[PDB]
Structure formats: structure tokens, C-alpha cells
Amino acid sequence: QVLAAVIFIYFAALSPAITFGGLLGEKTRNQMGVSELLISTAVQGILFALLGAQPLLVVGFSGPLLVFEEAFFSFCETNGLEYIVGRVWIGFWLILLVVLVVAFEGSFLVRFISRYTQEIFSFLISLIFIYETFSKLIKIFQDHPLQKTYNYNVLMVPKPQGPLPNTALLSLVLMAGTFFFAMMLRKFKNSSYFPGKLRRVIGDFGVPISILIMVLVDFFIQDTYTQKLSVPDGFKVSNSSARGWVIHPLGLRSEFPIWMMFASALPALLVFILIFLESQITHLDLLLVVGMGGVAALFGMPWLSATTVRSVTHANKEQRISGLLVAVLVGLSILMEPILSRIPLAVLFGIFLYMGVTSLSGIQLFDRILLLFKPPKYHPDVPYVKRVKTWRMHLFTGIQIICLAVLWVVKSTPASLALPFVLILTVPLRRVLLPLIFRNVELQCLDADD
Amino acid sequence: DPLQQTGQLFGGLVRDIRRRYPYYLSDITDAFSPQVLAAVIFIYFAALSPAITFGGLLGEKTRNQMGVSELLISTAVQGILFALLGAQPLLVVGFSGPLLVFEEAFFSFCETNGLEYIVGRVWIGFWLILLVVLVVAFEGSFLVRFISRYTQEIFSFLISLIFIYETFSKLIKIFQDHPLQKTYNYNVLMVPKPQGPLPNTALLSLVLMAGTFFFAMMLRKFKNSSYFPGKLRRVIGDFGVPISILIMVLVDFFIQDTYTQKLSVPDGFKVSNSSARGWVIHPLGLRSEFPIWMMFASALPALLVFILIFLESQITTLIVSKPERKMVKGSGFHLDLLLVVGMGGVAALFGMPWLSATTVRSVTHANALTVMGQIQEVKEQRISGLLVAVLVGLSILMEPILSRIPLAVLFGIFLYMGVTSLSGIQLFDRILLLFKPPKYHPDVPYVKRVKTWRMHLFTGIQIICLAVLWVVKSTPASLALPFVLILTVPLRRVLLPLIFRNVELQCLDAD
Ligand SMILES: CCCCCCCC(=O)OC[C@H](COP(=O)(O)O[C@@H]1[C@H](O)[C@H](O)[C@@H](OP(=O)(O)O)[C@H](OP(=O)(O)O)[C@H]1O)OC(=O)CCCCCCC
Ligand SMILES: CCCCCCCCCCCC(=O)OC[C@H](COP(=O)(O)OCC[N+](C)(C)C)OC(=O)CCCCCCCCCCC
Ligand SMILES: *[C@@H]1O[C@H](CO)[C@@H](O)[C@H](O)[C@H]1NC(C)=O
Ligand SMILES: *[C@@H]1O[C@H](CO)[C@@H](O)[C@H](O)[C@H]1NC(C)=O
Ligand SMILES: [Cl-]
């Protein structure tokens, strides 16, 4: 049973890892791509299985880190600075910050983060995925428009340099099909058909089965082009003309400025905020995560977070061996270059939209947002309807919606590096400003801990 | 009882009239509701598009003896008269697939034997009128007492499956006409139709069909949901199919440079081949003399056509007028059979096609007028079918609005129609129960009082019958499909009691 459980924890680890880094590649001009994230996830999984206190957590790239990497990439492109050396110095500031945390007693702010901030954070991260996949679809339709005629001798060796006949519609079809198949396998896992063991096994592999089906569909279409996953053959870096394997803190093409080394403290404090929040939703493990992320930043490798996983690895000392096996197999996943380069990006974007929509379903803020449109006689048995009036809970949800709108406006500004600051500013809003608007009983009934 | 044998001649017809015609003012004023307008807009497309497709196919199979215009005019006139005079006004009278097979087979016979096709059709219609008057006089329609849920559900499931299969085959044909290629010809002529492969036509057709089906199903689910005010929710859910059609038509309208196949109607109210025939067919030949023997040899094709129309039309009437669908105003079988076959025979005199009651269209029309909430009641009237027939008749003059409707949107609508027509069939429920474990079977008598492997054996015998009927539909002896269906009537009554116990037979088969 252990040999079967390590197969399951592979694919559950594989599907975001091949997705996010691909996103990261398209967000970083392949300077920071699939291979860096895969090898970083492998080495950090090995080290976390060997040295971690709690092996129930798994380490991997997540959405908030991707948003921060895009914010820093836009910051560097606007200021003309080098990106990955700034990442190196942010990492150095992370080592010094976390060793100060160890020198102090610990993180005493764990009680200040409430259900308010976690709901706002998760609803913002789920809203980012849908926006990103729809923006990618719009970009594909802008690259290859629906025209009466096309130039049928375009050159495609670096990238398609002109419009193409059926690429945009096939990308839309692949995205919709992958999302639909993932949602229906998720439905089938909770249905009443088939034997229960076989139904649960099939529904547990909902993402890999949909991925395999859509990859087969695109593979058996011969003439139409669809953009594929950019994966190098071996242990090589994604963009060799951009950076080497080891990245010196001084400079690659231009030396790093004196001012931005000491000013690297300000973005590095926000990395620690983002790692702290999503590890709390899912301090020795925080030490290992931040320290390994800062060490891996020297090699141009991504920071990871702490995420929880289902009880399949609990049924596998045994759970530490399973983590080491899945980490070394994630390392060996880069060796399967042909079957990873035959995967379209539209399949991964359908999976991306599926993960966003699935992540929306467990949030009480989303439940109240749906409760805005229902009549008051259809509101459920939950205590925040029986003990809080409909107008008061609607005002509460409207305030949270206003906060989400403020966060989305700030993320759209050029100064989008201040998103963790504005999002941690909701704790002074909850602990100070909300008791002036609401009463007490409504406040312990709405964002009640559980 | 609506299915009884009285000794007085034309007794079933006069009692059908006496039981349905007092409800005429309620049949007029029961339609004053937005759901009836939504049903009109739904059934108009659902009855116009098969008329266009079958008229084009008929004009291809013959030498334009019977084209799109004749089918549209006949459908409009027969629908108007059947709505104004019928005993079951919720039936939809239109062309069907077996009728096309008979018309091409009879055209092949008349071309081989050198006879005139339309005059032979006229004499077939005369014999049809004679046999339907004789059958209604003898009250022969009571024979449909011998059609139980076995034959009804087998026929309804077969028709729904062929509908879904035909829609998917149309989509696959659209893919085959415009394949996914590396390169295309830029100057493809478009005047009769596209003469070659085109980019973005197959995939956009698939996207339009999928989007229309998805919007129809989501707006169906919104009707039974708990969101929005209840009145607004019911109004939006009632117009779910028109809203889906409008949304995807607007999506196709805002895409400029991509070709999609649009709905096309003939121009003007004229015959398809003015040289071959006029408006009125003379029964004593048109250019040559009509032989006397074929005047008497029309009895066998008239019997075949009467058997076809009788079985589809009466099994449709038993399906729509089931007691589980909460029909209260009453139905009619003798009057409906008399009207359908008599107007078919009269329309054959003008060269117009004869028509029958179609199962999928009539079930869709009744389902679009059923008030949900478990079924409370059905909005039954004579205005929705009359307006659908009138709009089919005026659809030639509706060219600027019908030229903007792509065929893929209607293909998604047809897929939605087939999927919703599967619901309500116990054979489909047992087919679904074949895949569920016995833990999750519902609280129905045929699960509680019947062992689960016996229920599965009953379902498997029905699947064997469906497969045999599908094979008969595939082979060129497709006109024997009703007769093979007749073979399911002794199968319930003779062979099944040898292998099943009596309580299991009244539990699995009921009324
Ligand atoms: C490769 C597999 C091929 C199929 C081989 C299938 C061969 C096969 O064994 O299945 C028989 C199975 C019935 O099995 P059976 O009812 O005896 O066993 C029950 C069943 O497994 C339920 O799913 C369980 O409920 P839950 O979910 O745990 O809550 C229940 O557990 P418990 O709670 O009572 O203790 C079990 O007792 O279902 C079918 O009849 C046809 C399924 C459709 C067959 C699909 C045909 C494609
Ligand atoms: C919810 C609704 C879903 C519906 C999906 C239906 C798919 C049917 C596919 C039929 C293909 C076929 O048969 O394609 C046929 C053609 C080749 O035919 P040819 O050589 O021109 O034949 C000419 C024959 N003549 C000469 C008689 C005219 O192949 C292709 O160009 C490749 C089509 C690939 C289809 C993939 C589309 C995406 C499907 C998955 C979406 C999730
Ligand atoms: C990274 O690769 C891209 C191609 O996607 C290239 O345009 C860019 O110049 C590379 N970055 C370098 C060389 O720094
Ligand atoms: C009309 O009839 C003639 C003779 O049967 C035939 O040749 C012709 O194709 C038909 N159709 C048209 C449109 O003329
Ligand atoms: Cl049919």
C-alpha cells in the first residue's frame, strides 16, 4: 500500500509544479521556468523530509509567491535592474531575518491573524487564477485572430511570428475540455455510481486523467499548432543566455547597485509575510522553509511555502520515507522531457482555472457572497444567519468586497509590491475599526474561529 | 375509458369531440402566460430547422418534385388545422426520417417503372383517406390498448438515441467538410456553398454548439435553484432556451471574418420545380397517362404509410398523455388519427408531404409547458402550436432574422432537446441503475419487490431489443422497423411470462 501511496502523492505534487513554473516561465521570459522550480522542489522536499519536524506538510510553489515574483519582475523591468540578483539579495535578507526570529522567542502574531484575513487572502488568490487564465486566453486570441486569410508560410522556429489558422479556437477548446473533465471527475468522486473503491480511486486522479485525455486529444491532432510546455532535456537551466547555474551576488551583466542591496530589506520582509500567511492557513518548519528558500535564491530557484496534504501519506517514519521518495521522483521528472514537451499550455491553464474555482468552494466569504443573491428565506442553518440580521451580514460582506476591490486596484498599480502590506493592514481594520461599526455578538458570530 | 370498443359507428370520434371540445375557451385563455411565449419561441426553431433539412434532403433525393417550400407550406397548414381542430393540441405535426426513406424508395420505384412520382403519391393519399375513414368507422384505434410501457419506452428511447446520434453525426460531417489543415486556399468560392476547406469553421461550430448546450443546461438548472426572487427566477428559467439562442447568435454575430453555416429558407411561396409540376396535381397523369393497375396497386404502399404514421402518431399520443404528466383536459386517438392521415391524404393531392406526430418534438413541446415545483400541472392550450405553425408559414418572409442564426446553435439546442427528452423514461432509469450498486437504488416498487439481478435481466432484454431495432435501422430494410417494433407486443404478452413471474411483470411494467 505504501508503494501505491507514493504514486498518488507524486501526481498531486506534479500537477501544480508543471503548471505554476510554466506560468512562471511565461511571466519571466523563461529566465525562471519549469526546470528551476522542479529541481528546487525536489531538493527542498529531500531536505524537508530529512530534517523537518512535521512531515505531514509538503513544500511547493503556490499562487501568492507567483504574484510576488510577477510584482518583482515588473519592478525590475520598470527600474531596469537585474531581477535574479535582486532575488539573491532578498534571499540573504531572508536568512538574516529568520535567524533573528530564532534569536528571538518566536512569532507571537499568530493570534492576530483571524478568519477575516484568511478569507480575504484565499478569495484574492482564487480570483487571481481566473483572471490570469482569462488574460492568457485573450492574449492567445490577440496573437492569432480569426481572419479570412492567413500567411501560410510563416516561420515558427523561435515562436510563431504571425497569425495561425486554428490555434486560438483549439486552445479555447482544450482549456474548456480540461476544466470540464476535471469538474466532472470531481463530481463523479462524490456520486453514487460504480463500486465505491473504484469510484474514489478514479476521482482521486481527476487532474491527471483530464490532463492525459486532453494531451492525447492534442497529440492526435496533427496539422494544427498549439503552444507546448518549454522543458529542457536534462539538468540545464531554462534560458542559458540569461543566467548560469550559479548566480554571483555581484552581478551577471551589470553589477548590482549599492542602494538596492540595503533596500532589498523592504521586499524581503514581504516574502516572509506571504510565507507566514499560507503556512498558517494550511516555527522549526518555518525556519527550514525560509532558510532553504534563501539558500536556493543564490542558484536562482523559487521560494516555496508549507501546504498540507490528505491522509493518503499517513497510511503510507513511513511518512518521512514517502516524502523522500516523492522528492527524488520529482527530481527525476525532468528526465521525461518528450512527454512533458508534448503537453500543451492550454491543458495546464484549464487545470489552473479548475484549481482556482475549486479553491473558492471552501471559503465562508464566498458562501456569504452567494447568500447576497438568495432570498432571506433560503439562507442556511448556519449561526451567522440565525444570530445576525440579513442587513448586518450583507454590510459585513460588502466591507470585505470593498477590501478585495482595494487589493485588486493596488495589484493593478505599478506599485504592486505593497500588496502584502495592504493585505496585512486588514488586521488593524478587524481589531480596531470593525467594533465601531458592528456590535460584539455579530463580530464573534461572523468570523468565528473553528 | 378513452380506449374502448363501442358498437355505434364513429363512436370514438364523437366521444373524443364530446370530451375535448367543451374545453375550447379554456384552451384559448389558458395560454396567457410568458411560459407559452417561451414555448412558442423554442418550438418554432425546433420545428423549422427539421423542416428545412428534410425539405432540402427531399429535393436532393427527388428531382425537386418535393422541396423545402412544399414541406414548409404543408407543415404550416397542417399545424394550424391540427391546433384549431385537434383533440390533443400539444402534438407537433411534422416530417420525419422514415417518411423520407419511403419517399426516396417510392421515387426509385417510379423511376424504374417509368411512372409519375407525384401522381402515384396522389393515389396513395386517396387510399390513405379511404383506410383512415374505414379504421375510424370501425374504431380500430382501440388496438393501442396492447401497447404497454415496454413498447412505449423502447420506442421513445430509440427515437431519442437516434436524435442525439444524428446531431453528433451532423457535427462530425461539419468537421469532415472543413478539416484542420496546415494550409488552406484563400479564394474559395462561396456562392452555392464553400467549395473547399475553410479555417476556423469546424472549431467555431463546435464552440457554438457546446456553448449553446452549456447555457441551456445552466439556465435549466437556474430555474430549479434557490437564487434570485422566485418570480424573476421562474421567468428567466422559462426563457432559458431563447436566452441561450440569443446569446450565442450574438456571439457569432460579433465575429466578422469567420464563416459559419447559417439557416437558409427558400425565397417566395412558389414550387421548387415549376416545369415538373404545378400547385394542383391532376390524378389522371400530368404529361403521360396514369395506368389503371397502379390505381389499385397503391393499396400496399398506402398500408405501409398508414402503419408507419399510425404507430408513431399513436405511440406519441400515449407518451405525451400519460397520467404521470398531469394531463387533465383529455386527449383523443380516433380524432387525432383521422385528422393526421386525412390531411396527409388531402395534402398529397397538392404535391404536399404527408406528416405524422413526432415523438421528440411533441414531448419537448409538452415539457416546455409543464409547470415544475414534482409536476403540478401542464399549460395545455391551442395557441402555442397554432403560433408555431403560423411562424413556420411566415418563415419565408423572415429572411433577415433567420439569416443570422447559425446551424451550430440549433445543433446545441437539439442536443439539449434529446437530453431532456431522456428524462421521464423508466428504461433510462434502469439503465442508470445498471451502473449503481444496490445500496443506492431508489425507493420504487420495481426495486423493492423485484430482485436486482432480475431487474437487470429485464433491462438487458430491453437493451437487446434496442440493439436489434438499431441494426434494423442501419440495414437498407429500414421500413421494417415499425413491424419489428410490433414484435415487442407479443414479446411482453407471450415470451416474457415464461421467464418472469407475474408480480415482477406487473411491477416492472405498469401504467
Ligand atoms: C474494471 C471494473 C469493471 C466493473 C466490475 C464491477 C464488479 C463489481 O464488483 O461491482 C459490483 C458493484 C456492487 O457491489 P456491492 O454492492 O456488493 O458492494 C458495495 C459497493 O461497493 C458500494 O459502493 C459500497 O458502498 P460505499 O461506496 O463504500 O459507500 C458498499 O460498501 P458498504 O458501505 O456497504 O460497506 C459495498 O458493500 O456495483 C455494481 O453492481 C455494478 C457497478 C457498475 C459496473 C461498471 C461496469 C463498467
Ligand atoms: C460537447 C460536444 C463535444 C463534441 C465533440 C465531437 C468530436 C468529434 C470529432 C470528429 C473528428 C473527425 O471525424 O474528423 C474528421 C477529419 C478528417 O476527415 P476528412 O479526411 O476530411 O474526411 C473527409 C470525408 N468526405 C470526403 C466524405 C467529406 O479529421 C480532422 O480534421 C481532425 C478532427 C479532430 C477532432 C478533435 C476536436 C476536439 C474534440 C474534443 C473536444 C473536447
Ligand atoms: C530569455 O529567452 C528569451 C526567449 O524566450 C529571450 O528573448 C531573452 O533574451 C532571454 N534572456 C536573456 C538572454 O537574458
Ligand atoms: C426539375 O425536373 C427536371 C425533369 O425531371 C430535372 O431535370 C431538373 O433537375 C429538376 N430540377 C430543377 C431545379 O429544374
Ligand atoms: Cl423518427
Side-chain angles (χ1 to χ4, degrees), chain A residues 292-309 311 313 315 317-332:
Chain A
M292 293 183 286
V295 165
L298 279 73
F299 305 139
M301 291 192 149
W303 297 284
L304 315 173
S305 77
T307 43
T308 186
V309 76
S311 66
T313 188
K317 184 176 172 57
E318 286 148 345
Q319 58 186 357
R320 294 157 77 84
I321 298 172
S322 68
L324 162 73
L325 267 294
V326 65
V328 298
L329 287 184
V330 161
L332 299 185

Side-chain angles (χ1 to χ4, degrees), chain A residues 37 40-41 44-45 59-61 65 275 278 289-290 293 302-306:
Chain A
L37 190 148
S40 179
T41 308
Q44 289 192 47
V59 287
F61 206 73
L65 293 162
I275 295 164
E278 55 192 333
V289 159
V290 176
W303 297 284
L304 315 173
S305 77

